[PDB]
Design a protein around this ligand. Structure first.
Ligand SMILES: Nc1ncnc2c1ncn2[C@@H]1O[C@H](COP(=O)(O)OP(=O)(O)OP(O)(O)=S)[C@@H](O)[C@H]1O
Ligand SMILES: Nc1ncnc2c1ncn2[C@@H]1O[C@H](COP(=O)(O)OP(=O)(O)OP(O)(O)=S)[C@@H](O)[C@H]1O
Ligand SMILES: [Mg+2]
Ligand SMILES: [Mg+2]
Lengths: 432, 432
């Protein structure tokens, strides 16, 4: 049974924001998910937005056209789940009345899906006001329009929905599966989680927030094996690694971060990097570097020499293929799910980790495809500062002024099984 | 900051039940937790229970004595968290008024703990009635008393709490961290989860239920390596293993289980066992057998020959020590946390697994200590049927009538590092 997530709420309540975070998350953990924004369908269908009168609850023609856009969206939901193999579909619209919601419920039923509602509630004017400026004035409907007329139009637009707005009821809607998010995620009301995926969705939603903050990611300072061009193992810091550690501490101090939380793996290179700071930290083995199995501590030359077959396959699909007895980046993604969850729950946080692990975390907050994730560039002695924003995440690369070996290997042009060794190792960085 | 979980609710609302499940769970995942039942303190203090008049809200002396018992309980909470290194304490009492709750809140504050409330609400008479019979009439307060007078006394006892019962309020109690469970876990209200442990507590509580059902655990049918007395690896079924598979299918059919869910690991021996059934199943690598690392596929004789040091330590503490590159039963417990969670969420379920994995699952539902867990007996070709009940779990061992090698190794009397090999292998079962 695929899952149909139905967003519910007045305009400017963070529905699209939640829809996006949920869709990205579900896709990260490998559940084919796609969001369907009725507003975008309308925009593609209506061409240009004039004013709120289109949304008047007593505007029969408008309602008609509005119903048509919803249906167009629902039809693609059906195609995705029923014809393209999608697992979850997020239907993003106001869906503020019992009527529409029952209609959508019926759709799910006739199509064989399980329906779950996510209602976002906000009665706070400064937040609503903040949301308008922050996301609405810049949106397509209002770009190239005067801020004040745009703002008035939108408020009048929200008004169109108030008289008919029927929130999920404990008794009237007791048979529906749903979650109601209030106070921007302060409190929640949950009813009838029907299964495992809904339980994980609720778990996810209850742990996300919009409290301003930055996520800092950096690798342990250069290690002894990094110098040798050797992967994995449990090396200690190299002289430069130690230098970096001191540059990181100064950076962290200079940052003057409010209540920063610092995490490291259980590998000495990250811990030794963490020892350099003023602030305390927590070590978690879940943050340990990807396991290379039989090629642990080997150099790429050695790997090509002993595992030419596995090395070629891994290059062909570096997300899915692994070395014998090792993890794939896919296994690592699965392994990092708890990390992703706690990072969402966290506020200001610094994670001192490793190349593969950092690529996984960057891919998550930067919404990078699985195919692209194994190749993201995570240079040594550089801090990547992430500032989650509406629908996206800004990133800043901050070099901490300490030389370091390059551990980034590009995918060689030749990835054919039985490829000459020279072509296999052509993209290997300098070392020793 | 240790955590103080405060139970809240009218008598017979499953508070003690929830308190117990929560405490057991938290301890299973390694968080030192202890529950403090004020009713038990009262029982140890008051000696014998006469009647409900003791609980009259206008009974000043009773209130006084009732306050004394609460305080005695709170003092042990303080000792556990503040002096014995406990992490979480569950204070189990009605705590139905704002007054008492504020008092407890203050206690937590002065002691440096984070307070989290768990309120259980039930307005269903048949359930309340069921609870009385099911747990109350047999309890100490009522054992050896006539069912009818016992029952009347208890109802009048619940009455004592109704006029003063003040449930957690969205506005009045908006600054408190809490969860309200309704309809026996149908719906929930959650407010201000303050941290990681509270997030996991909520996640746990929202996934437990009291829907009648049985958990069936059995190992894959005897495997080729089981015959040889070889551990781990990925062997296929032995001839007897196949025989068992057919006996299991018949057993499952004969059981006539409503909507049974079947789980196996990604190891062929369990899958091959699962192939024998009518019903479909899901394979999860999280259910794979404990990893023996460098001793994979070896025999104990071989292990003693190549790893006399690691083998002795493992025998000294089989929960914590591991073979080089392998998992400890502790690592396995951590690994199985998602399995425990989904098992709680499940109803009728059959899990076809392995020796170490099954020991971990048995220890959880049977509340066996960590020290005892690595040694639980999980014979081949036998199904262990678990029927969760109030405060406990009944277990029935059902042999499926197929011969099998014994893979159970008792802890030898000699576990000294440098112990003679004959004494180390003295408890090794017959094989080959
Ligand atoms: N739970 C929340 N409560 C209130 N605002 C939120 C919440 N989550 C996100 N936001 C903010 O809402 C903004 C994003 O709003 P959108 O997702 O466009 O709202 P919207 O409800 O989809 O309005 P429509 O699509 O026009 S009906 C960003 O400023 C978010 O930080
Ligand atoms: N969420 C729940 N709703 C209602 N009953 C429950 C719930 N969870 C468990 N039970 C049932 O409640 C019984 C256990 O009740 P207890 O835990 O003794 O109640 P109690 O609320 O602790 O009463 P006291 O301690 O006398 S104040 C068992 O029958 C459970 O199956
Ligand atoms: Mg929207
Ligand atoms: Mg109780």
């Amino acid at each position: 049974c695929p899952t149909l997530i139905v967003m519910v709420g007045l305009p400017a309540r963070g529905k699209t924001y939640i829809s996006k975070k949920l869709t990205r998350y579900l896709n990260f953990i490998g559940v084919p998910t796609r969001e369907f924004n009725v507003g975008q369908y309308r925009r593609d269908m209506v061409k240009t937005y004039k004013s709120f009168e289109f949304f008047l609850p007593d505007n029969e023609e408008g309602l008609k056209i509005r119903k048509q856009c919803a249906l167009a969206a629902l039809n693609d939901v059906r195609k995705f789940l029923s014809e393209e193999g999608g697992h979850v579909a997020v239907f993003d619209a106001t869906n503020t009345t019992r009527e529409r919601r029952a209609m959508i419920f019926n759709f799910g039923e006739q199509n064989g899906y399980k329906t779950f509602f996510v209602e976002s509630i906000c009665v706070d004017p400064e937040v609503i006001a903040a949301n308008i400026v922050q996301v609405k004035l810049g949106s397509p409907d209002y770009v190239n329009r005067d801020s004040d007329e745009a703002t008035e139009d939108f408020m009048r637009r929200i008004e169109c929905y108030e008289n008919s707005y029927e929130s999920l009821d404990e008794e009237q809607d007791r048979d529906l599966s749903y979650i109601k998010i209030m106070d921007v995620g302060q409190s929640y009301v949950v009813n009838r989680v029907a299964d495992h995926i809904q339980s994980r969705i609720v778990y996810y939603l209850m742990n996300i927030h919009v409290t301003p903050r930055s996520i800092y990611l950096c690798r342990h300072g250069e290690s002894e094996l990094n110098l040798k061009g050797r992967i994995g193992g449990d090396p200690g810091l190299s002289p430069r690694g130690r230098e970096f550690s001191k540059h990181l501490a100064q950076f962290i101090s200079d940052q003057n971060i409010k209540d920063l939380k610092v995490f490291t793996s259980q590998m000495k290179r990250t811990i030794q990097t963490a020892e350099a700071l003023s602030v305390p930290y927590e070590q978690f083995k879940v943050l340990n570097e990807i396991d290379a199995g039989v090629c642990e501590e080997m150099t790429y030359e050695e790997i090509q020499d002993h595992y030419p077959l596995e090395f070629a396959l891994r290059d062909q699909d570096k997300y899915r293929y692994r070395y014998p007895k090792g993890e794939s980046y896919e296994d690592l993604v699965q392994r990092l799910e708890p990390v992703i969850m706690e990072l969402e729950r966290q506020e200001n946080v610094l994670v001192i980790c490793h190349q593969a692990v950092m690529r996984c975390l960057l891919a998550y907050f930067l919404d990078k495809a699985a195919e692209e994730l194994p190749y993201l560039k995570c240079p040594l002695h550089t801090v990547l500062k992430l500032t989650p924003v509406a629908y996206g995440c800004k990133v800043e690369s901050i070099f901490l002024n300490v030389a370091a070996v390059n551990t980034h290997r590009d995918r060689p042009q030749n990835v054919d099984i039985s490829r000459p060794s020279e072509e296999a190792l052509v993209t290997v960085p300098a070392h020793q």
